[model samples]
Target: SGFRKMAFPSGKVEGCMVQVTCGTTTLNGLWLDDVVYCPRHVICTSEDMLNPNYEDLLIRKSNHNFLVQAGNVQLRVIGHSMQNCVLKLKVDTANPKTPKYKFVRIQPGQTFSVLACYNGSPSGVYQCAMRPNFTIKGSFLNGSCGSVGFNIDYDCVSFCYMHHMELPTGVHAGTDLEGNFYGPFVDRQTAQAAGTDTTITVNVLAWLYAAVINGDRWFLNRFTTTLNDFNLVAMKYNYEPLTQDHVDILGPLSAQTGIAVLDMCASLKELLQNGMNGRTILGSALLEDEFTPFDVVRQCSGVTFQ
Candidate 1:
């Protein structure tokens, strides 16, 4: 375990003085007034805490407290912050073109967990911070989230964008147009000339969906044929088809989710397979010099041209 069990030292002075060191930074002269003790550890008012362990148990200026843990394929955010806040998690801070995961209206004592990967691999080095209001005020980082394991997967970049753009609107759509899509413009000069409207469009989503379907269709065809061949071989050995009764189940599922799981599985597979090509298509299909994040969000999340 990266964490050791620590609590406020017993028999401390009421207005006790202590210094806390998290990572390289240390806070001297932290007051004990706003400190709260929990079964796990102590939360207090200080500058910021990182890789949270105790040189001394004291908290921060804000009522909010955070606990972070790094895992093999995921990172966990434990909100002991007595007040509510929004947490934003992103991967690969070195490059600005990273995708992010956001959670809103998180209350105190809540544990929020999200996948650290983009498609199926670790996206990049994980960095996260908490915002009580829209503006960033007080925050801190624990251990390096993606340092131990995780890398950029260029093969699935476009599909990653598809997922990034597939939000329900009014979300942060990361990074730039040309480089993110890899030569979407005639050249870098033309890309810059296109201006700040670099968001994705519905047209891009349609192309992405098409690319994904193409890949997934190939995957499904091969997958089903292999299954059928296996069943045929098994039949000769007295084994029957192991099919599920999904007539009743699939109808409602398709309606609720807007696509059948079986069908969606193929699309998802396609997206994974042809993500790069999908970005290429988005770049070329639109003749305009530049496209913006708003273009992508509007078309994907809301109604747009067919």
Candidate 2:
């Protein structure tokens, strides 16, 4: 019997507009972008790679003061008012002994921003505020004004992986360990069903290869865990165990793109449980149906790229 499988002679890479500023030097390129897209794999960053528009950030009013809200590891404070005033920001209101303060000056109508180093703890709400008591020319200025408080999560892991497993920035080809160029494999079985037209299928395998190797431990752990759990379900039904090779070939054809590939596998598993015929039961189940890549990556070992 002949089976169709996707192969990527070369891996893939994610491309986006990037800019880096350090003192006197500024660098720009797709590489500089935080979300580097490579076939099935995606690189993560602490900053916003997809949307860098700070102007789009929403500003809230608390009492008489204004607060600009942004998340993910870095807390950014931007001055919007035209009146010349000094601004002070502090963190962890409960712990008075913890002295963390960031200050910036606002010139009339000029918008300026300052970066405050904050861990953005996942366990609790980020408690920080901005007020009018700040230093100007080595002297503390006092004024009667309302203070703005910010209550938002600032952790990168929470921002990137908590809501959904996004497909990085965009589609791009990547080279694998075997020196093969592969693109994103949306479906694995459909390509096998195609029989002869295997360009898409092979590209899909290439992408998977790239993802497994290039992805951080947070990503790879998820992949391995999903594979193990799904294979166990297959055993429970008196079926042969599935392997990574199955993922490389049939995984892409099951789903057109992204993590949905696991959903397709789950459907097949359900059919098998109810004694579906051989034709109805494909060789493998989806790793994603039971778990997401983001959720499982925390459990695995190896080089974790968090």
Candidate 3:
């Protein structure tokens, strides 16, 4: 068994300092607070922390601060300075959009890490900051390699941030998880008029699926039989996850996510299966919510459309 562990190295002394003895873990983050201080040597990478090792910014390594930037996966954010943070987390991680964060309050800290929703919902400040591998996309496994075994499906892109999970009322998803304003615009026309890449209107149609789809595989198998009736053609050609019905029901988060990261998701296939025929089943007439994540087998999480 090749057992490995993450390291809590000194930010000053940099290197892949893992599984070694760091003084049996001294109380790190000693005497530091107040004002702003941006590190001149800022580091940002898309490498997801040494890949095969996974151990990217594990929660425990964060010591006891929420501002740690582990995987930098989802809408990454860091506290350049000490500040107040209002974490409106949901209560239930599995049911509705905001059961409220799974605890405690966030006091002012110079670097409170906005951990991605993947590890575990915000249980409590210390509790949250104390959980296991809870970085953005930073876990022990994330790969498609045939032999690896435990490949967690999907990326950190679609997983909503734990605190601000509820989509604001109306106006489609409107922003990235960190609220970067992905709402709307007018790129279709200009004073001089113009035409460009067909990729321009690729109309990815933000399928905005549910939290239940993380490791989904069953739907991948049932895809073909679900799309014969026609909704896929309609949305693909013109882009309609925005259709009033679709948006109101599916939750509009297209800009920040894509159902197909590689191939169209099973959720999309199921939704499209009945999206046109008054939103229901395979003429097998399965009701709108049938194959959807909202139903029993999957028990889809909520998006708070209101």
In model 3, the Cα lDDT at residue 220 comes to 35
lDDT of candidate model 3 versus the reference = 0.21
lDDT of 3 by residue, 1-306 (tens): 111111211121111001101112111111112111111111112342123121222322331232321123221122232111111111111221211121122111101222222222111111112111111112212110000001011211111212211112111111122222212211111122112111101122221232223332223323432232234554563322223343333343332234432233344445444453443222222212112212211222322211
Off by over 4 Å in 3: 1-179, 184-306
* Best model per lDDT: 1
Better model by TM-score: candidate 1 vs candidate 2: 1
Task: Give lDDT tens digits, candidate 2, residues 173-241.
Answer: 112212122222221112211111111222223233333333311222232235566667766654445
Q: List all candidate RMSDs to the true structure.
A: 21.5, 22.1, 20.3
TM-score of 1: 0.20
Q: Give me candidate 3's TM-score against the actual structure.
A: 0.19
Candidate 2 overall lDDT versus native: 0.23
Q: How do the candidates rank by lDDT, highest first?
A: 1, 2, 3
